[PDB]
Copies of this chain bind each other. A is one copy, B any other.
Amino acid sequence: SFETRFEKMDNLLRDPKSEVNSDCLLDGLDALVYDLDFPALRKNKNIDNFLSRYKDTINKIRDLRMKAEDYEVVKVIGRGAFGEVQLVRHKSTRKVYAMKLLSKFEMIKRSDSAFFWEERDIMAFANSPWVVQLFYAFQDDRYLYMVMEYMPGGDLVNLMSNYDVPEKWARFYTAEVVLALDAIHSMGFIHRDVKPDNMLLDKSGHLKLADFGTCMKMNKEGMVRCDTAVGTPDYISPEVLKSQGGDGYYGRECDWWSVGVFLYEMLVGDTPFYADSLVGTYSKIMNHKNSLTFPDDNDISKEAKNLICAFLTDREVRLGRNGVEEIKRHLFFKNDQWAWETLRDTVAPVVPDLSSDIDTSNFDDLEEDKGEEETFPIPKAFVGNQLPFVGFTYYSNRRY
């Protein structure tokens, strides 16, 4: 039908999940202009003409759409591999966010995943109190921008470095992690990188998972096929670590292993497979059957040691294989202060006391500054570097 066709097309331009919504189309144009405006390419008439035709229009668009200078950078609160995280205030709305910058050139400089799509999808549509929310996503010729809710409570790395975590706390945080991971699993993902760095606390001291670049969609049988290992040396499971070209076929039990490493670290103060060098940790993980020991410290309860050992075993006998319910029923979690279904409504073990909305005391003081770093080299022919990041913008077609 004629109407049907017009309508199907109209939805395809509206749907927040459509690859051709206003966001994707405005990105498509924005990318083209960026990838053509070069004197070497300007020699071609088609190109030179097209650019002069849209010059005024494209400049109007870039000013109207969400851009970097719309935000006032309050302070850098994280910096690393593919960019940095900075506490920002929107100059117009005065609202405070944590903005993440991803160097387009650096991700193209041999990453191998386009990992940012998973990160964008989950953070934007998860709609879960266990997932750091993504409000806006935009871009220019050089950086991807992710506008997330600010987690003023800092991460679990910071918490563990300031406290000798008692069991009561360990239980709470482990329990919130379990629910957070179960929410991710219910969405059809295996996180693959469960660690204190990815665990952030809100203004009330409650946990959320941040960063999901390592996430992968499960198949129908709830499995994932991967030839190359993914994760962090201390927290990676034996099966994900040994994942090879031979196959590399694993389930969500690999996440539960990392939770065991997390629990152990909170109560002991060290990772269960710490070694002199990185490669030593590898051997100890593979030899987990004999390398996993508890120090002579009569403060780790029986239940704690049990759960840790139930998690730090071979995938085949690992706790969590029969669903999250067998984990929740574990005696370690048995308490009289909270229930699973009401946990995130209870008072947290550490409720952060904040001075202002821009209080960054729970984050280490990072230098800030830089002086803009090297990006793409000026092309001599058409390369199309902005093409992989088309449709990343989350602004014109957001879900409400």
A interface with B by C-beta (< 8 Å): 1-2, 5, 8-10, 12-13, 19-20, 22, 24-26, 28-29, 32, 36, 41, 44, 46-47, 49-50, 53-54, 57, 60-61, 64-65, 90, 92-93, 114, 381-385, 387-388, 390, 396
Ordered by A's residue number, 25 sampled pairs between the chains whose C-beta atoms are within 8 Å are A1-B92, A2-B93, A5-B64, A8-B64, A9-B396, A10-B22, A12-B60, A12-B61, A12-B64, A13-B396, A20-B26, A20-B29, A20-B57, A24-B29, A25-B25, A25-B28, A25-B29, A29-B29, A41-B382, A44-B382, A50-B384, A50-B387, A50-B388, A381-B382, A382-B382
CB proximity of A10 to chain B, nearest CB, Å: 7
Q: Give complex CA distance A93, B6 in Å.
A: 13
How far apart are A237's CB and chain B's nearest CB, in angstroms?
29
- Cα distance A43–B59 in the bound complex, in angstroms: 31
Additional 10 contacts, C-beta under 8 A, given A10-B396, A46-B384, A50-B388: A13-B396, A19-B53, A20-B26, A20-B57, A25-B26, A36-B384, A46-B388, A47-B382, A47-B387, A381-B381
A contact face: mostly helix, strand, loop, or mixed: helix
Minimum CB–CB distance from A350 to chain B (whole Å) comes to 35
Bound state CA distance, A65 and B25, in angstroms?
Answer: 15
Q: Please name all residues of chain B whose beta carbon is closer than 8 Å to the beta carbon of A390 when the two chains form the complex.
A: 50
- Please, how many angstroms separate the alpha-carbon atoms of A221 and B323 in the complex? 79
How many angstroms between the C-alpha atoms of A381 and B13 in the bound complex?
A: 31
- Nearest B residue to A24 via CB reads B29
Distance in angstroms between the alpha carbons of A8 and B65 in the assembled complex: 10
Partner of A28 from B2, B32, B65, B385 at Cβ < 8 Å: B32
A50 CA / B53 CA spacing, docked (Å):
25
| B20 and A383 contacting across the interface, CB-CB below 8 Å | no
Please give, as numbers and ranges, the residues of chain B lying within 8 Å of A93 by CB-CB distance.
2
Q: Which residue of chain B is the closest to A64 with respect to CB atoms?
A: B9
Closest to A385 in B: B46
Cα(A93)–Cα(B41), bound, Å: 44
* Minimal beta-carbon separation of A88 from chain B (angstroms): 14
Q: How far is the CA of A49 from the CA of B114 in the complex (A)?
A: 10
Q: Please give, as numbers and ranges, the residues of chain B lying within 8 Å of A9 by CB-CB distance.
A: 61, 64-65, 396
The complex places the Cα of A54 from the Cα of B388 at a distance, in Å, of 11
Residue of B nearest to A53 (CB): B19
- With a CB–CB cut-off of 8 A, which chain B residues contact A46? 383-385, 387-388
Please, how many angstroms separate the alpha-carbon atoms of A57 and B18 in the complex? Answer: 9
* Closest beta carbon of chain B to A52's beta carbon, Å: 11
Chain B residues contacting A10 (CB-CB under 8 Å) are 22, 396
Q: Bound state CA distance, A46 and B53, in angstroms?
A: 25
Closest-by-CB residue of B relative to A22 is B13
Given A13-B396, A396-B13, verify A92-B2 contact (CB < 8 Å): yes
Point out the residues of chain B lying under 8 angstroms from A28, CB to CB.
25, 28-29, 32
